[PDB]
Each structure stands twice: as structure tokens, then as C-alpha cells.
């Protein structure tokens, strides 16, 4: 019992080590992962401007994560886990530490959020996407968010401070880095920090990633197995964010909102144990992010190891690289792309050359086929969403049946499918069997009966029963 | 006696 006997934190030797070992494991895994990532994204050098934007945002994320681990952890391990008093890094050490910590933190939260926006635009607004962001415009946006991170961390230079809390006036063992302004200001700072680096991005992420996942689910067996993992990764990313960051913000808020008359030896002891738990998870974020945001990638799988409607239509329309005549006698190419209704084969050919911008002679590549396909599906969903008679029906449907509606619009057009007035109300009211019986009575069903029945079957079951042929 | 480590 001396003048700094009160500053003593009582965490058992067991815990302190178990936590050190954990921390040091995260430190190797995380610093490697984020570095390897930086190395691996540098040499990729993609051609597409949409996929390279993502590579930039991902690079930014990996740096801000690396920097958390390198700047926040060493000092935490010495001064907040093992040796709580005295603070051994001076007044400017105290101010600089919380500045940097919060900056990297802000930079990660904003990164993760901006990335989610980027992906929302790429997929849901592809027209604007290409016209709204290219290599130089994102490079500048990444800069905007490191400056913004830097600005939002400035308050921590003015609110943290070195201070002697010894019983005695001032013994050198009683110096501690801690907030040193009116609880009123500390309470407001803290809550801003909590809103601007947890709540705000929480919504952005949690909403946009759910909208992407759902949309990407409908857009989409070996051929597409990676895109289905991507969907799972997207839902995982939110889960990872909440679990790893919420308890860290809970703990900061408890630090300031529990008043002096309420602090006991019990809560005080419980805090510093909780501190161990919340900060382990906090850092885990930085260690997992590289391996989570990049596991579904192509080479990357190897790399660290070296240290609905697409499917349905690909069955129903097939893939041909040379010009053919469809069911009805019209020249078509690729995956169901109708070129023209004119009986002239030169008219088709002319129209094809026009479609891609190259003197094909009536033959195309697999990549060209898929380029046209993505455009025609874009076209079919816009048709549905702007149509008074199809949008309500589409909205009411699960992901599998939505695709089956897109199948019909792909084959027949917006205004074609719109004529199925009674079958569409049945679908909208979940009368799956009635709809199916009624769809089977149509001209569409006589013209192309296998395809029709597969779609019909999909409508009545919501299963993949009809598409065993899919790869 | 409250915590000083934020």
C-alpha cells in the first residue's frame, strides 16, 4: 500500500499470458496476411476498371488493418495489459497514440463502407457505375477518406493527456494517459467516435451488402460456384464486423457513462478483464479481414497457400458461337441473343458486327457471348421493374421464382409476359398449381414445351427440380 | 476509484 496502490489492476498471471499469446498470434497472422495481400494486389494488374476499383479499395483496407496492428498493439501490450502505471510514453506519446489509433480505425470503417457502396453501384447501377468512377476518380476518393479519418481523429489530440493520479500530489509511478477534460466533452467525443466509426458504417454495410447478396443470388453449377461463395462472404462480412467491433464500443461507452458513485472494486476489476476480451476481438477484425475479403478470389486461394438466372438460361438458351436460327426461324447468337427478325443472313451479320464492334463474319468468342448476355438480362430486369403489371409480381417472389419470371421476359419480352394477366395474379397470390395449369394452356407452351415446362415446374415448386442438366 | 485506461 503506497501512493500508487490504487492504480494497480488485478488481472491474474494466467489471463495476462493467454491474452499475450493470443495477441501475438493475431499479430503474425494479421501482419503477414495484410502484407501478402498488398504484395498480391500489386502484381495482379487487372484490365477492367470495375475490378481494379475493388482492388484499390481492398488495398486501402489492408493497409489500415496493417497499421492498426503495428501502431496500436505494441504499446497496448506493454502499457494497457502488463504495466498499467505509470504511462511510459510522455504527454505527446499519449496524444499521438490515440490520434493514430482513431485515424487507422476511422480509415478502416470508412474503407469497408465505401467498398460496399462501390459494389452496390457496380451491380445495381452499372450505367452510372462506369460513368461515375474510374481509376483516377477512386484513387482520389481513397485519399478523401484518409484525410477524413485524419480530421475526425484531431479531437483526440486535445482530449487525451498525461496526468498524475497518485494519492500523493505527484509521484512518477502515478502518471497515466487518460482523457483529461470535462466528462461532458468526453461523453460527446466518445459518442461521436462511436457513431462515426460504428453506427454509420453499420447501416451502410448491413443494408447494402444484404441488397447486393439478394441481387447477386438472382443473377446467378461448377461454373458459378465462386459467385455463390461471394454471396456467403458478403453476409459473413457484416457478422464479422458486429461481433468484432460492438463490444469494443460498448466498453468505451461504459468507461464514460458509469459515474463515480457507481464504480466499485467489482466493476473496476470486471472492466480490465472485459478490456482483454474486447480488444482481442477488435484486433481479430484486422487479422481476418484479409483472409475473408479475399478467400473467394481465384488465385488468392493459392496465393496465401503459397506463403440463378445465368444457370437457368444457360440450360434453356444454350451457348452457340456461330449464328443459328431459333425456334421460330430467326437468326440468333450466343445465349439467346436475337440479332434480327429479317430473313437476310447478311442483315443478321451486319447487326452482329454492330453489336460488338468488330468484323466478326458471324462468329464470336465465349467472352463476347457473356458480354451480350449480361446486357440482355440487364434489359429484361429493367423491363420488369418499370412495368406496372410485372413489378408487383416480381417483388412478391422468392429468388428462384423471380429468376423464372426473368426467364419468360428474356424469351418473350416485357409486353409479351405482361399479357399473361391471370397467371400473373395467381403467382402474385401464391396459387402455384393454378398458375401452372393455366400457363400450360398457352401458345408459349406449344411453341417450346420442354423449356416452358421447366419454368412452369420452377414456378410451382420454387426448387431446382427441373434443372438437373445445369453445371 | 474508476478505470483510467480508455
Author numbering:
A (entry chain A): 49 to 268, 297 to 383, 1002 to 1165
B (entry chain B): 8 to 13
The authors write:
Previously, we determined the structure of NTSR1 bound to NTS8–13 (Arg-Arg-Pro-Tyr-Ile-Leu) in an active-like conformation with six thermostabilizing mutations providing insight into the binding mode of a peptide agonist. The conserved W3216.48, oriented parallel to the membrane plane, seals the top of a collapsed Na+ ion-binding pocket; W3216.48 in combination with F3587.42 link the agonist peptide, bound near the receptor surface, with hydrophobic core residues in the inner half of NTSR1.
The comparison with NTSR1-ELF is thus expected to provide insight into the structural role of E1663.49, a residue critical for governing receptor conformation and G-protein recognition. The aromatic ring of F3768.50, a conserved residue of the H8 motif, is well resolved in NTSR1-LF but is only weakly anchored in a hydrophobic pocket between TM1 and TM7. In G-protein-coupling assays, NTSR1-LF had moderate ability to activate the G protein. Thus the mutation E166A3.49 alone may explain the pharmacological behaviour of NTSR1-LF, highlighting the importance of E1663.49 for G-protein activation.
